Enzyme design. Structure first.
Site, PDB file in Angstrom:
ATOM      1  N   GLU A 275      -4.185   7.137   8.049  1.00 19.89           N
ATOM      2  CA  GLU A 275      -4.818   8.073   7.133  1.00 19.89           C
ATOM      3  C   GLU A 275      -6.122   8.569   7.739  1.00 19.89           C
ATOM      4  OE1 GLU A 275      -4.415   4.893   6.472  1.00 19.89           O
ATOM      5  OE2 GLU A 275      -6.402   4.025   6.130  1.00 19.89           O
TER       6      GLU A 275
ATOM      7  N   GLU B 134     -10.043   1.885  -7.231  1.00 24.77           N
ATOM      8  CA  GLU B 134     -11.126   2.155  -6.298  1.00 24.77           C
ATOM      9  C   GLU B 134     -10.921   3.489  -5.591  1.00 24.77           C
ATOM     10  OE1 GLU B 134     -11.062  -1.187  -3.698  1.00 24.77           O
ATOM     11  OE2 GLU B 134     -11.604  -2.632  -5.255  1.00 24.77           O
TER      12      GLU B 134
ATOM     13  N   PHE C  75     -25.617 -10.591   9.413  1.00 25.27           N
ATOM     14  CA  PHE C  75     -25.815 -10.221   8.011  1.00 25.27           C
ATOM     15  C   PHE C  75     -25.214 -11.256   7.066  1.00 25.27           C
ATOM     16  CE2 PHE C  75     -26.152  -5.537   9.317  1.00 25.27           C
ATOM     17  CZ  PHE C  75     -27.521  -5.647   9.420  1.00 25.27           C
TER      18      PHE C  75
ATOM     19  N   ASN D  32     -17.057  -5.854   5.265  1.00 31.62           N
ATOM     20  CA  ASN D  32     -16.177  -5.235   4.274  1.00 31.62           C
ATOM     21  C   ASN D  32     -16.125  -6.049   2.983  1.00 31.62           C
ATOM     22  OD1 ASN D  32     -15.803  -3.559   6.429  1.00 31.62           O
ATOM     23  ND2 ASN D  32     -13.581  -3.832   6.577  1.00 31.62           N
TER      24      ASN D  32
ATOM     25  N   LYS E 121       0.818  -1.210   0.000  1.00 31.39           N
ATOM     26  CA  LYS E 121       0.000   0.000   0.000  1.00 31.39           C
ATOM     27  C   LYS E 121       0.853   1.263   0.000  1.00 31.39           C
ATOM     28  CE  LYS E 121      -3.936  -2.218   2.244  1.00 31.39           C
ATOM     29  NZ  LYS E 121      -4.660  -2.208   0.943  1.00 31.39           N
TER      30      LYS E 121
ATOM     31  N   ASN F 197      -6.858  -2.904  -7.845  1.00 28.44           N
ATOM     32  CA  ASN F 197      -6.911  -4.348  -8.023  1.00 28.44           C
ATOM     33  C   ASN F 197      -6.348  -4.710  -9.392  1.00 28.44           C
ATOM     34  OD1 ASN F 197      -8.211  -5.431  -5.557  1.00 28.44           O
ATOM     35  ND2 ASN F 197      -9.913  -4.113  -6.191  1.00 28.44           N
TER      36      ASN F 197
ATOM     37  N   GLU G  69      -6.431   1.952  -3.174  1.00 26.34           N
ATOM     38  CA  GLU G  69      -6.070   0.625  -3.667  1.00 26.34           C
ATOM     39  C   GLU G  69      -6.375   0.442  -5.151  1.00 26.34           C
ATOM     40  OE1 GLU G  69      -8.274  -2.579  -2.030  1.00 26.34           O
ATOM     41  OE2 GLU G  69      -6.865  -4.136  -2.668  1.00 26.34           O
TER      42      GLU G  69
HETATM   43  N1  LIG Z   1      -9.470   5.350   5.068  1.00 25.05           N
HETATM   44  C1  LIG Z   1     -10.692   4.808   5.085  1.00 25.05           C
HETATM   45  N2  LIG Z   1     -11.729   5.572   5.493  1.00 25.05           N
HETATM   46  C2  LIG Z   1     -12.953   5.037   5.513  1.00 25.05           C
HETATM   47  N3  LIG Z   1     -13.330   3.801   5.177  1.00 25.05           N
HETATM   48  C3  LIG Z   1     -12.286   3.068   4.779  1.00 25.05           C
HETATM   49  C4  LIG Z   1     -10.966   3.481   4.704  1.00 25.05           C
HETATM   50  N4  LIG Z   1     -10.155   2.452   4.247  1.00 25.05           N
HETATM   51  C5  LIG Z   1     -10.991   1.459   4.061  1.00 25.05           C
HETATM   52  N5  LIG Z   1     -12.293   1.760   4.362  1.00 25.05           N
HETATM   53  C6  LIG Z   1     -13.447   0.874   4.261  1.00 25.05           C
HETATM   54  O1  LIG Z   1     -12.983  -0.466   4.254  1.00 25.05           O
HETATM   55  C7  LIG Z   1     -13.312  -1.101   3.000  1.00 25.05           C
HETATM   56  C8  LIG Z   1     -12.171  -1.987   2.568  1.00 25.05           C
HETATM   57  O2  LIG Z   1     -11.308  -1.235   1.690  1.00 25.05           O
HETATM   58  P1  LIG Z   1     -10.217  -1.952   0.802  1.00 25.05           P
HETATM   59  O3  LIG Z   1     -10.682  -2.089  -0.592  1.00 25.05           O
HETATM   60  O4  LIG Z   1      -8.888  -1.219   0.979  1.00 25.05           O
HETATM   61  O5  LIG Z   1     -10.065  -3.366   1.506  1.00 25.05           O
HETATM   62  P2  LIG Z   1      -9.239  -4.704   1.254  1.00 25.05           P
HETATM   63  O6  LIG Z   1      -9.634  -5.779   2.185  1.00 25.05           O
HETATM   64  O7  LIG Z   1      -7.758  -4.329   1.263  1.00 25.05           O
HETATM   65  O8  LIG Z   1      -9.630  -5.043  -0.247  1.00 25.05           O
HETATM   66  P3  LIG Z   1      -9.317  -6.130  -1.375  1.00 25.05           P
HETATM   67  O9  LIG Z   1     -10.184  -7.331  -1.200  1.00 25.05           O
HETATM   68  O10 LIG Z   1      -9.549  -5.390  -2.696  1.00 25.05           O
HETATM   69  O11 LIG Z   1      -7.821  -6.422  -1.222  1.00 25.05           O
HETATM   70  C9  LIG Z   1     -13.640   0.043   2.050  1.00 25.05           C
HETATM   71  O12 LIG Z   1     -14.544  -0.378   1.034  1.00 25.05           O
HETATM   72  C10 LIG Z   1     -14.277   1.068   2.989  1.00 25.05           C
HETATM   73  O13 LIG Z   1     -15.646   0.773   3.240  1.00 25.05           O
HETATM   74 MG   LIG Z   2     -10.872  -3.675  -3.585  1.00 25.75          MG
END
Ligand SMILES: Nc1ncnc2c1ncn2[C@@H]1O[C@H](COP(=O)(O)OP(=O)(O)OP(=O)(O)O)[C@@H](O)[C@H]1O
Ligand SMILES: [Mg+2]
Ligand SMILES: CCC(=O)SCCNC(=O)CCNC(=O)[C@H](O)C(C)(C)COP(=O)(O)OP(=O)(O)OC[C@H]1O[C@@H](n2cnc3c(N)ncnc32)[C@H](O)[C@@H]1OP(=O)(O)O
Ligand SMILES: *C(=O)CCCC[C@@H]1SC[C@@H]2NC(=O)N[C@@H]21
Lengths: 247, 673, 261
Positions: free
Chosen positions: B206, B281, B354, B241, B122, B296, B294
């Site tokens: 962040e 995204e 859920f 998530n 990241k 993908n 991020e």
């Molecule tokens: N800085 C942030 N502020 C608010 N919500 C956030 C933040 N970072 C992540 N989220 C929430 O968490 C969710 C997960 O984000 P992200 O796509 O980075 O997750 P991931 O598990 O790394 O994804 P992937 O399966 O694509 O690897 C986002 O869709 C959002 O709802």
């Molecule tokens: Mg994603």
């Protein structure tokens, strides 16, 4: 409920290896009309299943082996439970449908001392004397005299079908190998050839012991049609006041 | 679709399920032979039968079947497969896999190793995006190591602090802070959990966006340095998530913001030199400000929903790009072709958190393919088995229409006309979300499920008119079954005297209320009076078909009769929710008033296993006085670990669950008081 | 010049000797008689008429087509005779040939005798001494058993059926005696069990012997399967004649009436 309805969910219900077990009630529910089944004695001698259902609107009696309980082996209680139901269904012109998956009879001294021979004879007699149309489907194992008991074609059975996973033999492939090739002591390839030649429904098929090897998804469509043509079945037997069932 | 186009002759799909079926279908449309890899369990799946040839690549577990490098490589050697499509997940983002593929002679259909390496971490992705002048989320650069640094960063990023660990797809390693006290204690806890998870101890700090919207820009790039942005997608509706409902055209966005987002995504892709199909995204706030979050580097799960609004087969374009041909369309060629909505039908119980993964075998499975504007992506069939080893996703349902309302109506109809018997599914939750007033209006966020259902999903709350319709339908069905019971064939020995009853007086128990229903029949029309309200129900009354369409006072309703007993109990799926109704005759109810109530042995004090799988550890022992909200144990299945809370205070009487032991669904694990 | 007469005489002399004189001596060492002398004791002198004397098995797998594996009669002696002037049909299983195991020809001969008996209306007496089902035959053997079983149910209540177990009987060979009207055993020699003691140890892990598992005392004192037990073959056959004197020949005949003093 259409009589030609396919049942694709039965295509893989039987597991590949014989160690695992499945539920025969699922097969029964899939095959019968509207998936409605009135099971008799559902909590007693659970290794066998008997009940009433409908095929194309006609009342039918269902008898089957339950591999979940005791691997489907027959014993005293299951023998009596199946035998009386079969006798009742025959006495009132109700067709019989049998699902066969049985490795044999339950071993032990309790079964022998309780008279397992008499009750196995009860079930064999009940299936043999029936003059109502009877349709048999073999889903997997059929070993030894149990195969004769569970409504074989040689008991004046009408139609017998085998699924591709079925296997009809005198006894297990292993024990057959060590009982045939006892002095050969080189069973390394003998076992392979024996399982490739006999551990399948072909020996029963080529000798005509099963009418056909059907796909599991057509079972209902195969049964209803038979029940349409066997409704006028009529046989003649020698006169007697009554027979002497091994009660 | 040009067969004359000389593309690869044989392609290996190193994946399973719906994506495998989709890739196989796309390859077959292009006249390309396919190779399907599978485990021992998936020896009769849809994708192995659909594709010619098949290779067993190990046992049931994914780590030894689909993550097994050696088996896949040997299969590629044996089949002489020129190219491989990884799909999404598994080895889709593995650099060592890319090295092995690029080793001998075979091309990898996807991003190059450099792009995957750049986007894997990241911090590097964020700095690359900053170099690519793309609006990044307010946060520091590097790796934070001390609480003083964390609070110093929080000084400029504000009190809202989003502590996110490196990697951890699926929502892992994410925490929320609200104060400097919260900042440093959460940063301690995040360092602890990062050491526990992977030991990287690389944490990203962040600003936390309030009420965010997840907007994905689909990008398509070739090896000639051309990048195209194909509109956007919206995936705000999420639980754990993870996205469940996706909307292709963002109603929140407009033309100018969409163009700016697409241009930024294209610029970032050019900076990374992406040469495949990917998604970028963003978290758009309420003030239409988009921040990068991020990228993908793989085919997205919800890629079909944009296809319907673009008329482009993304898999076909990916294969053509992998061959070496340039993009066949320009930026102006991309044009919105309406509205599209996608829903993920899972094999989970929506009433528990859920969604709670469940196992089983499909006794019946029918898709609403005949309905207009419906597309189904499913890798399952009747008789398929849901096992703990793989993703419990059943299918993806996509509806396209001229506008949002038509698409939503088609989605509701398809959900009502979709038959799954054998397992528990979340169709009730999906249908309740679709017809939700907030969702229809357009005001949604990433926490829509949480705030709309605070306590949890309780089911559709049917109104007075809907309750009357349900009662009328149930009474009519009961009377129809009773009437059918009297239709025997002619006997010619003892003729049957059919009763000539006119009005059926019935007591119908729903939830806890009891209603008096007077039903009459006039052939195919039932006149039903429920507590004075008069309704007319007309239908063909086919009691065997899984789906029954009825017309109550002109309104058309599709219902399913899941169960029915001689005692009067009936389970009816109506408006997507399963309701249990107990129907008796009036005399039967009057006599039933004298029946004694059987003792029920339900005084809490016991906690069974709500989910099957393998228990990782047991946090309780006999003689332990647990409290409300204290988790008894954690159980893992289908890439998810869940800990069920006791929900009550009581000393543990006994413990039947041991760490590392396989535990089935419903098994009694811990007894308490 | 034709050698058909010499071949016929050789086949006859082989059929009378069964599977060989050495195996006859081994059978006699166990205190057991052979099938033919059992029939001679049971029936009136000079009244036995044999049937299917030259019938041989038709198996060809596992090297069963060799001349060393061909026996005229195939481990069963079938025919008709008279007890005190009354007709009866009899089969006696020959333990000398393949341990008395049932094959296609064995079942065919038994079925033919039973069909003749039900056609004319005469009782059937069966002396059971059989290891079980011939594994080399395969499913055919099973089929044969089923055929017998069917007839055992068709003749039930039509003609009396008597079974006398004079040796080991296992697997599917125990069901024909169970379907008959009366079942007699010989002490210390006869056995009746579906599975042997070795399988019982393999499955249920308990120590029992053949005598405890399926002996005459077990089936005449606690199992309820057998009706009477006799000390040896000669006394058993004498009592069998005495018992047969009581029964009618068919269900269409009245109860027998004898001279009374
Ligand atoms: N800085 C942030 N502020 C608010 N919500 C956030 C933040 N970072 C992540 N989220 C929430 O968490 C969710 C997960 O984000 P992200 O796509 O980075 O997750 P991931 O598990 O790394 O994804 P992937 O399966 O694509 O690897 C986002 O869709 C959002 O709802
Ligand atoms: Mg994603
Ligand atoms: C209904 C439930 C089932 O199906 S249970 C599994 C099926 N079982 C069978 O088919 C056969 C079971 N019987 C046997 O295993 C043995 O014969 C028993 C009866 C246990 C041993 O009896 P025993 O007193 O020791 O006699 P023995 O060993 O001295 O006899 C040896 C001769 O008899 C023969 N024999 C015996 N059984 C078979 C057979 N099934 N198939 C072929 N031959 C058989 C042996 O080959 C041997 O031959 P020979 O006469 O010495 O030349
Ligand atoms: C288990 O069999 C693996 C399922 C596929 C991987 C899952 S699907 C959704 C998540 N996103 C992703 O790229 N991988 C995860």
């Amino acid at each position: 409920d259409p009589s030609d309805r396919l049942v694709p969910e039965l295509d893989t219900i039987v597991p590949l290896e014989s160690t695992k077990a499945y539920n025969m009630v699922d097969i029964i529910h899939s095959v019968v009309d509207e998936r409605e089944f009135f099971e008799i004695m559902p909590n007693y001698a659970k290794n066998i299943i008997v009940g009433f259902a409908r095929m194309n609107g006609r009342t039918v009696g269902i008898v089957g082996n339950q591999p979940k309980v005791a691997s489907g082996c027959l014993d005293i209680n299951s023998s009596v439970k199946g035998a009386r139901f079969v006798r009742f269904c025959d006495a009132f012109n109700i067709p019989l449908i049998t699902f066969v998956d049985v490795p044999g009879f339950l071993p032990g001294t309790a079964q022998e001392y309780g008279g397992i021979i008499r009750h196995g004879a009860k079930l064999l007699y009940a299936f043999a004397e029936a003059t109502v149309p009877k349709v048999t489907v073999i889903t997997r194992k059929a070993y030894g005299g149990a195969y004769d008991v569970m409504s074989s074609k040689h008991l004046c059975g009408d139609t017998n079908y085998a699924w591709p996973t079925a296997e009809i033999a005198v006894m297990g492939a292993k024990g057959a190998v060590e009982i045939i090739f006892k002095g050969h002591e080189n069973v390394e390839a003998a076992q392979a050839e024996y399982i490739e030649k006999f551990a399948n429904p072909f020996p029963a098929a080529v000798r005509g012991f099963v009418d056909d090897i059907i796909q599991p998804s057509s079972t209902r469509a195969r049964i209803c049609c038979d029940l349409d043509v066997l409704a006028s079945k009529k046989v003649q037997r020698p006169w007697r006041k009554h027979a002497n069932i091994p009660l | 679709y040009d067969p004359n186009e000389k593309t690869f002759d044989k392609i290996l799909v190193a994946n399973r399920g719906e994506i495998a079926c989709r890739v196989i279908r796309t390859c077959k449309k292009m006249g390309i032979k396919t190779v399907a890899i599978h485990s021992d369990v998936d020896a009769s799946s849809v994708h192995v039968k659909m594709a010619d040839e098949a290779v067993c690549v190990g046992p049931a577990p994914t780590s030894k079947s689909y993550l097994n490098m050696d088996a896949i490589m040997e299969a590629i050697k044996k089949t002489r497969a020129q190219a491989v499509h990884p799909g999404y997940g598994f080895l889709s983002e593995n650099k060592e896999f890319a090295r092995c593929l690029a080793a001998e002679d075979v091309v990898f259909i996807g991003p190059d190793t450099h792009a995957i390496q750049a986007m894997g971490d990241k911090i590097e992705s964020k700095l690359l995006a900053k170099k690519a002048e793309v609006n990044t989320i307010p946060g520091f650069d590097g790796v934070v190591k001390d609480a003083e640094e964390a609070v110093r960063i929080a000084r400029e990023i504000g009190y809202p602090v989003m502590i996110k660990a490196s990697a951890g797809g699926g929502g892992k390693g994410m925490r929320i802070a609200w104060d400097d006290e919260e900042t440093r204690d959460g940063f301690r806890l995040s360092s602890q959990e990062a050491a526990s998870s992977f030991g990287d101890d690389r944490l990203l700090i962040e600003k936390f966006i309030d009420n965010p919207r997840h907007i994905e820009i689909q990008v398509l790039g070739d090896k000639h340095g051309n990048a195209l942005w194909l509109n956007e997608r919206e995936c705000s509706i999420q639980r754990r998530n993870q996205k469940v409902v996706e909307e292709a055209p963002s109603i929140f966005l407009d033309a100018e913001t969409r163009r700016a987002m697409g241009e930024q995504a294209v610029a970032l892709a050019r900076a990374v030199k992406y040469s495949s199909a990917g998604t970028v995204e963003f978290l758009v706030d309420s003030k239409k400000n988009f921040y990068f979050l991020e990228m993908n580097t793989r085919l997205q799960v919800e890629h079909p929903v944009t296809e319907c609004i673009t008329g482009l087969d993304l898999v076909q374009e990916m294969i053509r790009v992998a061959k070496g041909y340039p993009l066949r369309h320009k930026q102006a060629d991309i044009r919105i072709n309406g509205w599209a909505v996608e829903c993920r039908v899972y094999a989970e119980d929506p009433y528990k958190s859920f969604g709670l993964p469940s196992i089983g075998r499909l006794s019946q499975y029918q898709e609403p393919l005949h309905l207009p504007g419906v597309r189904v992506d499913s890798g399952i069939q009747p008789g398929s088995d849901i096992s703990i080893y793989y993703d419990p996703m059943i299918s993806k349902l996509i509806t396209y229409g001229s506008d949002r309302t038509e698409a939503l109506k088609r989605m509701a109809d398809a959900l009502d006309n979709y038959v799954i018997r054998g397992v528990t599914h979340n169709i009730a939750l999906l249908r309740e979300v679709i017809i939700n007033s907030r969702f229809v209006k357009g005001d949604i966020s990433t926490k829509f499920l949480s705030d709309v259902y605070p306590d949890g999903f309780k089911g559709h709350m049917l109104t007075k008119s809907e309750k009357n319709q349900l009662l009328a339908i149930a009474s009519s069905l009961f009377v129809a079954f009773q009437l059918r019971a009297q239709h025997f064939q002619e006997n010619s020995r003892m003729p049957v005297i059919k009763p000539d009853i006119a009005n059926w007086e019935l007591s119908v128990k729903l939830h806890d209320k009891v209603h008096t229903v007077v039903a009459s029949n006039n052939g195919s029309v039932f006149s039903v009076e429920v507590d004075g309200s008069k309704l007319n129900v007309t239908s063909t009354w086919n009691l065997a078909s899984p789906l029954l369409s009825v017309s109550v006072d002109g309104t058309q309703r599709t219902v399913q009769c899941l169960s029915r007993e001689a005692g009067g109990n009936m389970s009816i799926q109506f408006l997507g929710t399963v309701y249990k109704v107990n129907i008796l005759t009036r005399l039967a109810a009057e006599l039933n008033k004298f029946m004694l109530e059987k003792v029920t042995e339900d005084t809490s004090s016991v906690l069974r296993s709500p989910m099957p799988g393998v228990v990782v550890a047991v946090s309780v022992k006999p003689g332990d006085a647990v409290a409300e909200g204290q988790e008894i144990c954690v159980i893992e299945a289908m890439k998810m670990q869940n800990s069920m809370t006791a929900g009550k205070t009581g000393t543990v009487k006994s413990v039947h669950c041991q760490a590392g032991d396989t535990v089935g669904e419903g098994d009694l694990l811990v007894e308490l008081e | 010049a034709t050698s058909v007469n010499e071949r016929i005489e050789n086949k006859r002399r082989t059929a009378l000797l069964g599977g060989g004189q050495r195996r006859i001596d081994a059978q006699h060492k166990r205190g057991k008689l052979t099938a033919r002398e059992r029939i001679s004791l049971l029936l009136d002198p000079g009244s036995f008429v044999e049937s299917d004397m030259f019938v041989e098995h038709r198996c060809a797998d596992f090297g069963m087509a060799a001349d060393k594996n061909k026996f005229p009669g195939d481990s069963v002696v079938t025919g008709r005779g008279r007890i005190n002037g009354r007709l009866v049909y009899v089969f006696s299983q020959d333990f000398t040939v393949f341990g008395g195991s049932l094959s296609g020809a064995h079942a065919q001969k038994i079925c033919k005798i039973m069909d003749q008996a039900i056609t004319v209306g005469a009782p059937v007496i069966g002396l059971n001494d059989s290891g079980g089902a011939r594994i080399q035959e395969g499913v055919e053997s099973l089929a044969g058993y089923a055929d017998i079983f069917l007839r055992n149910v068709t003749a039930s209540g039509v003609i009396p059926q008597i079974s006398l177990i004079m040796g080991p009987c296992a697997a599917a060979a125990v069901y024909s005696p169970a379907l008959t009207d009366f079942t007699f055993m010989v002490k210390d020699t006869s056995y009746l069990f579906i599975t042997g003691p070795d399988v019982v140890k393999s499955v249920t892990n308990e120590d029992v012997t053949q005598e405890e598992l399926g002996g005459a005392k077990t089936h005449t004192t606690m199992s309820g399967v057998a009706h009477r037990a006799f000390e040896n073959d000669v006394d058993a056959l004498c009592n069998l004649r005495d018992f047969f004197n009581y029964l009618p020949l068919s269900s269409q005949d009245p109860a027998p009436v004898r001279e009374c003093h």
